[PDB]
Design an enzyme around this catalytic site. Structure first.
Site, PDB file in Angstrom:
ATOM      1  N   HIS A 150       0.859  -1.188   0.000  1.00 39.61           N
ATOM      2  CA  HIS A 150       0.000   0.000   0.000  1.00 39.61           C
ATOM      3  C   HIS A 150       0.902   1.248   0.000  1.00 39.61           C
ATOM      4  O   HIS A 150       0.762   2.115  -0.863  1.00 39.61           O
ATOM      5  CB  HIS A 150      -0.894  -0.020   1.263  1.00 39.61           C
ATOM      6  N   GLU A 151       1.859   1.305   0.931  1.00 34.49           N
ATOM      7  CA  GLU A 151       2.747   2.469   1.027  1.00 34.49           C
ATOM      8  C   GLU A 151       3.619   2.656  -0.209  1.00 34.49           C
ATOM      9  O   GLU A 151       3.756   3.765  -0.717  1.00 34.49           O
ATOM     10  CB  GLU A 151       3.606   2.413   2.299  1.00 34.49           C
TER      11      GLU A 151
ATOM     12  N   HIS B  30      -9.739   7.587   2.326  1.00 31.95           N
ATOM     13  CA  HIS B  30      -9.746   6.123   2.261  1.00 31.95           C
ATOM     14  C   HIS B  30     -11.197   5.685   2.140  1.00 31.95           C
ATOM     15  O   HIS B  30     -12.095   6.393   2.594  1.00 31.95           O
ATOM     16  CB  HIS B  30      -9.201   5.497   3.565  1.00 31.95           C
TER      17      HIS B  30
ATOM     18  N   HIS C 283       1.756   4.039  -3.079  1.00 26.09           N
ATOM     19  CA  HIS C 283       1.403   5.456  -2.955  1.00 26.09           C
ATOM     20  C   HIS C 283       2.415   6.303  -3.748  1.00 26.09           C
ATOM     21  O   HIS C 283       2.134   7.454  -4.124  1.00 26.09           O
ATOM     22  CB  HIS C 283       1.414   5.902  -1.479  1.00 26.09           C
TER      23      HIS C 283
ATOM     24  N   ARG D  46     -13.103  -1.392   1.284  1.00 26.41           N
ATOM     25  CA  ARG D  46     -11.701  -1.629   0.974  1.00 26.41           C
ATOM     26  C   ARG D  46     -11.604  -3.137   0.749  1.00 26.41           C
ATOM     27  O   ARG D  46     -10.924  -3.594  -0.161  1.00 26.41           O
ATOM     28  CB  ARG D  46     -10.781  -1.180   2.111  1.00 26.41           C
TER      29      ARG D  46
ATOM     30  N   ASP E 270      -4.468   0.178  -2.225  1.00 32.52           N
ATOM     31  CA  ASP E 270      -5.040  -1.056  -1.687  1.00 32.52           C
ATOM     32  C   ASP E 270      -4.937  -2.212  -2.694  1.00 32.52           C
ATOM     33  O   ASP E 270      -4.512  -3.327  -2.349  1.00 32.52           O
ATOM     34  CB  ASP E 270      -6.522  -0.840  -1.358  1.00 32.52           C
TER      35      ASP E 270
ATOM     36  N   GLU F  75      -6.045   6.006  -2.584  1.00 35.15           N
ATOM     37  CA  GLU F  75      -6.101   4.947  -1.579  1.00 35.15           C
ATOM     38  C   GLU F  75      -6.538   3.605  -2.150  1.00 35.15           C
ATOM     39  O   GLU F  75      -6.003   2.550  -1.775  1.00 35.15           O
ATOM     40  CB  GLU F  75      -7.011   5.357  -0.430  1.00 35.15           C
TER      41      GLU F  75
HETATM   42  C1  LIG Z   1      -2.815   0.219   5.207  1.00 37.12           C
HETATM   43  C2  LIG Z   1      -2.948   0.963   6.566  1.00 37.12           C
HETATM   44  C3  LIG Z   1      -2.298   0.147   7.695  1.00 37.12           C
HETATM   45  C4  LIG Z   1      -2.202   2.302   6.547  1.00 37.12           C
HETATM   46  C5  LIG Z   1      -2.722   3.324   5.512  1.00 37.12           C
HETATM   47  N1  LIG Z   1      -1.985   4.622   5.736  1.00 37.12           N
HETATM   48  P1  LIG Z   1      -1.843   5.818   4.547  1.00 37.12           P
HETATM   49  O1  LIG Z   1      -3.095   5.751   3.727  1.00 37.12           O
HETATM   50  O2  LIG Z   1      -0.587   5.631   3.840  1.00 37.12           O
HETATM   51  O3  LIG Z   1      -1.765   7.209   5.307  1.00 37.12           O
HETATM   52  C6  LIG Z   1      -2.750   7.843   6.070  1.00 37.12           C
HETATM   53  O4  LIG Z   1      -3.693   8.536   5.256  1.00 37.12           O
HETATM   54  C7  LIG Z   1      -3.117   9.606   4.503  1.00 37.12           C
HETATM   55  C8  LIG Z   1      -4.125  10.162   3.529  1.00 37.12           C
HETATM   56  C9  LIG Z   1      -2.509  10.703   5.382  1.00 37.12           C
HETATM   57  O5  LIG Z   1      -1.818  11.632   4.508  1.00 37.12           O
HETATM   58  C10 LIG Z   1      -1.456  10.023   6.284  1.00 37.12           C
HETATM   59  O6  LIG Z   1      -0.798  10.939   7.196  1.00 37.12           O
HETATM   60  C11 LIG Z   1      -2.098   8.844   7.051  1.00 37.12           C
HETATM   61  O7  LIG Z   1      -3.052   9.298   7.986  1.00 37.12           O
HETATM   62  C12 LIG Z   1      -4.190   3.528   5.796  1.00 37.12           C
HETATM   63  O8  LIG Z   1      -5.126   3.076   5.173  1.00 37.12           O
HETATM   64  N2  LIG Z   1      -4.490   4.362   6.956  1.00 37.12           N
HETATM   65  C13 LIG Z   1      -5.939   4.564   7.218  1.00 37.12           C
HETATM   66  C14 LIG Z   1      -6.453   3.374   8.099  1.00 37.12           C
HETATM   67  C15 LIG Z   1      -5.982   3.570   9.538  1.00 37.12           C
HETATM   68  C16 LIG Z   1      -4.683   3.591   9.968  1.00 37.12           C
HETATM   69  N3  LIG Z   1      -4.645   3.828  11.331  1.00 37.12           N
HETATM   70  C17 LIG Z   1      -5.951   3.967  11.815  1.00 37.12           C
HETATM   71  C18 LIG Z   1      -6.413   4.221  13.146  1.00 37.12           C
HETATM   72  C19 LIG Z   1      -7.806   4.309  13.313  1.00 37.12           C
HETATM   73  C20 LIG Z   1      -8.714   4.144  12.184  1.00 37.12           C
HETATM   74  C21 LIG Z   1      -8.227   3.899  10.893  1.00 37.12           C
HETATM   75  C22 LIG Z   1      -6.806   3.807  10.698  1.00 37.12           C
HETATM   76  C23 LIG Z   1      -6.119   5.928   7.953  1.00 37.12           C
HETATM   77  O9  LIG Z   1      -5.111   6.630   8.239  1.00 37.12           O
HETATM   78  O10 LIG Z   1      -7.270   6.256   8.227  1.00 37.12           O
HETATM   79 ZN   LIG Z   2      -2.956   5.076   1.926  1.00 38.27          ZN
END
Ligand SMILES: CC(C)C[C@H](NP(=O)(O)O[C@@H]1O[C@@H](C)[C@H](O)[C@@H](O)[C@H]1O)C(=O)N[C@@H](Cc1c[nH]c2ccccc12)C(=O)O
Ligand SMILES: [Zn+2]
Ligand SMILES: *[C@@H]1O[C@H](CO)[C@@H](O)[C@H](O)[C@H]1NC(C)=O
Ligand SMILES: *[C@@H]1O[C@H](CO)[C@@H](O)[C@H](O)[C@H]1NC(C)=O
Ligand SMILES: *[C@@H]1O[C@H](CO)[C@@H](O)[C@H](O)[C@H]1NC(C)=O
Length: 696
Positions: free
Chosen positions: A530-531, A658, A534, A664, A597, A593
């Site tokens: 996923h990262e 997301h 991006h 998802r 995914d 996103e």
């Molecule tokens: C694959 C997953 C482990 C990590 C993935 N992080 P990522 O999308 O790279 O990054 C996240 O969203 C971006 C838009 C922001 O710019 C970032 O700072 C970060 O918040 C994600 O879906 N994050 C979601 C899901 C999530 C992560 N931590 C959470 C805690 C509570 C609820 C949902 C979440 C989010 O930030 O929402």
């Molecule tokens: Zn992401």
């Protein structure tokens, strides 16, 4: 040939208890994967959303509480500060005894709040100026109102910082709320009522007369004002192309192209910029390069601001800052936010004080708290295993470039270049544990008083803003991490071209050196993909190997990218969310996103297959009549198990880039041939549509 280890039985029990085997996997994998969990759980009164991620966050907070609540003799100063901050935050008696007193003391420093001030025009209006008032809030307290001016990384030169000018955030979740009808009506009513409630509390405390009609009249005018500002902001859909948002201009070109007349001024962009930068004793000339992300907003703003008095503007400006402080004051002030938060989040109660406090110090001292967290909960030998998984997935990304028919050789080469350059960050920076001097120095300028929580948070606002503004002439620090270690999440930075996996996310269900590999690749493997993906989504693809906004795509390949992506825009745009009252997701806002995914899950699966080929099948888990290919997808889906409050669903469908967890799961698996093959899904069964989207 069944694994009977403690670790296998723990993960098997979790998988078993969460799933609902009575549901056909091919009809609805979210229900099959999460049905057991859904039936057993109810969203806590203090939660907006609940599920795997939120449960992991709640659990991390328990650890934080354990490491912050007890002073230890050999604690370095950095740690003593985090604990003192924690202690000042959890002492509600001390906070309640102060009433709104700390806020009242603060008001004169931001030109007051007209509604809760007698003869505002004489007192402040005399020396008031848009450029000074906006700047004061911006530079001393980090509150960006009307015009969001900030120092950030130059999209076109990764190593430098530049001044940016953009449209501001709104008091409500998104510009949509400002329609103020139907699903947004309660939020708008609570918002204005919230304004009125605080103004009333301030007046009662300051011993001023209270004309209910006058309060309503003034606050409705701030709502009228913000409505206009909201309508003037550009939609997210028109801000999703980095290349088009980047408009470098000189302050002179800005003063020429974006005139503004406020309270009869006119507005001086040079004075405004210097009123801000002076905070750090940095001088700016009209020859200064500025990146304007919202030229149209600035243009539309001109006619709006001429219709409002300095009093109207300040009523909104100070309100926007005051609404963020009210919860750090006494119970009476805290309670005034009740209806507003219920309207935005659906919560009927505030999260436990110790949790809000652990979170607050973790967010303000991420390295100090990260250090305690990892010492208490992270096994350093996990870093190596993760390093290896990343090496594997990066490889799979590159290998896959050859199979992709929609890109030409020239573009694949550059994509490979970018992929190879991705810098990984795993767990925590070793420095936070091994270099006490550096850790202490990071917080040197901070001094916390245990009985003064409010003064403590204000100090943090000033410090963080000063730190940020001081970066204008400095180079971007290469070794700087974009996230603390005690965070349940993962990230990708376009400007630094780096992937970060904090210690907080390197735990079950995502990862464990002791859990089955099918689970690891389905969880953390998918997260790594996923990262990495991006760096190649509709936003990231625009940045090169060094984080510079520059086109490395041929016209045809760029065109094909949009064509392949379009399929996901329509797929997700077609999902209707019941919790959000049947509305459709925004296929454009969630595109990036969704690409991550879909790309990430396929990359992880490919890597798992490589692992199996090279290492042989794994012992199966006891109690589950599923093989490892099936467990791979089951674990992936369980990462997303969860549910939302209706009010927050209305909020997230607009503000979250997301897709909701269930989509998802459904969207990604619908596009996966490997999934349908793993679960023997008939063609055109819900989880197996003939038409499948794919980009990476
Ligand atoms: C694959 C997953 C482990 C990590 C993935 N992080 P990522 O999308 O790279 O990054 C996240 O969203 C971006 C838009 C922001 O710019 C970032 O700072 C970060 O918040 C994600 O879906 N994050 C979601 C899901 C999530 C992560 N931590 C959470 C805690 C509570 C609820 C949902 C979440 C989010 O930030 O929402
Ligand atoms: Zn992401
Ligand atoms: C809270 O602050 C008050 C006022 O300073 C003080 O009397 C009390 O000891 C503090 N409580 C704790 C647990 O530190
Ligand atoms: C900004 O302009 C005001 C006049 O409105 C002036 O008093 C102030 O000193 C100027 N500030 C700076 C930093 O130039
Ligand atoms: C739904 O999918 C169809 C099929 O491509 C598409 O034409 C339509 O625009 C989509 N609707 C939404 C809201 O995305």
């Amino acid at each position: 040939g069944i694994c009977k280890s403690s670790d296998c039985i723990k993960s098997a029990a979790r998988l078993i208890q969460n799933m609902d085997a009575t549901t056909e996997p091919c009809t609805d994998f979210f229900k099959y994967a999460c049905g057991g969990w859904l039936k057993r759980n109810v969203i806590p009164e203090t939660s907006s959303r609940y599920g795997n991620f939120d449960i992991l966050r709640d659990e991390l907070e328990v650890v934080l509480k354990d490491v912050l609540q007890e002073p230890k003799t050999e604690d370095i100063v950095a740690v003593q500060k985090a604990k003192a901050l924690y202690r000042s935050c959890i002492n509600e008696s001390a906070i309640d005894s102060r009433g709104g007193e700390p806020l009242l003391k603060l008001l004169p420093d931001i030109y007051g709040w007209p509604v809760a001030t007698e003869n505002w025009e004489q007192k402040y209006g005399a020396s008031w100026t848009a450029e000074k008032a906006i700047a004061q809030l911006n530079s001393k307290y980090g509150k960006k109102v009307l015009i969001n001016l900030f120092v950030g990384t130059d999209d076109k030169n990764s190593v430098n910082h530049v001044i940016h000018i953009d449209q501001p955030r709104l008091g409500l979740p998104s510009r949509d709320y400002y329609e103020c009808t139907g699903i947004y009506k309660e939020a708008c009513t609570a918002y204005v009522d919230f304004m009125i409630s605080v103004a009333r509390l301030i007046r009662q405390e300051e011993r001023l007369p209270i004309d209910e009609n006058q309060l309503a009249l003034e606050m409705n005018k701030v709502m009228e004002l913000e409505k206009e500002i909201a309508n003037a902001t550009a939609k997210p859909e028109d801000r999703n192309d980095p290349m088009l948002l980047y408009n470098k201009m000189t302050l002179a070109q800005i003063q020429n192209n974006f005139s503004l007349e406020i309270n009869g001024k006119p507005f001086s962009w040079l004075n405004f910029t210097n009123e801000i930068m002076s905070t750090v004793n940095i001088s700016i000339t009209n020859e200064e390069d500025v990146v304007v992300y919202a030229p149209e907003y600035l243009t539309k703003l001109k006619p709006i601001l001429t219709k409002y008095s300095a009093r109207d503007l300040q009523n909104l400006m100070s309100w926007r800052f005051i609404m963020d402080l009210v919860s750090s004051l006494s119970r009476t002030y805290k309670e005034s936010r009740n209806a507003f938060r219920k309207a935005l989040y659906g919560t009927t109660s505030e999260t436990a004080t110790w949790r809000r406090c652990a979170n607050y110090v973790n967010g303000n001292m991420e390295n100090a708290v990260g250090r305690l967290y990892v010492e208490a909960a992270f096994a350093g030998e996990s870093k190596h295993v993760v390093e290896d998984l990343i090496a594997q997935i990066r490889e799979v990304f590159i290998q896959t470039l050859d199979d992709l028919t929609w890109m030409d050789a020239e573009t694949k080469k550059r994509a490979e270049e970018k992929a190879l350059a991705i810098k990984e960050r795993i767990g925590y920076p070793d420095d936070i544990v091994s270099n006490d001097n550096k850790l202490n120095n990071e917080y040197l300028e901070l001094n916390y008083k245990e009985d003064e929580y409010f003064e403590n948070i204000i100090q943090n606002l000033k410090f963080s803003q000063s730190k940020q503004l001081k970066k204008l002439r400095e180079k971007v620090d290469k070794d700087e991490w974009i996230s603390g270690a005690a965070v349940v999440n993962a990230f990708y930075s376009s400007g630094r071209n780096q992937i970060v996996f904090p210690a907080g996310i390197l735990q079950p269900p995502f990862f464990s050196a002791q859990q089955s590999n099918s689970l690891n690749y389905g969880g953390i493997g998918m997260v790594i993909g996923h990262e990495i993906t991006h760096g190649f989504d509709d936003n990231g693809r625009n940045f090169n190997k060094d984080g510079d906004l520059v086109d490395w795509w041929t016209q045809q390949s760029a065109s094909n990218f949009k064509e392949q992506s379009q399929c996901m825009v329509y797929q997700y745009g077609n999902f209707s969310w019941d919790l959000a009252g049947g509305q459709h997701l925004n296929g454009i806002n969630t595109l990036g996103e969704n690409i991550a995914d879909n790309g990430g899950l396929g990359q992880a699966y490919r890597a798992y297959q490589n692992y199996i080929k090279k290492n042989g099948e794994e012992k199966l888990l006891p109690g589950l009549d599923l093989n490892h290919k099936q467990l791979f997808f089951l674990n992936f889906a369980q990462v997303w198990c969860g549910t939302y409050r209706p009010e927050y669903a209305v909020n997230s469908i607009k503000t979250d880039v997301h897709s909701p967890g269930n989509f998802r799961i459904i969207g990604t698996l619908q596009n996966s041939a490997e999934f349908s093959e793993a679960f023997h899904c008939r063609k055109n069964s819900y989880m197996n549509p003939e038409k499948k989207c794919r980009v990476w």
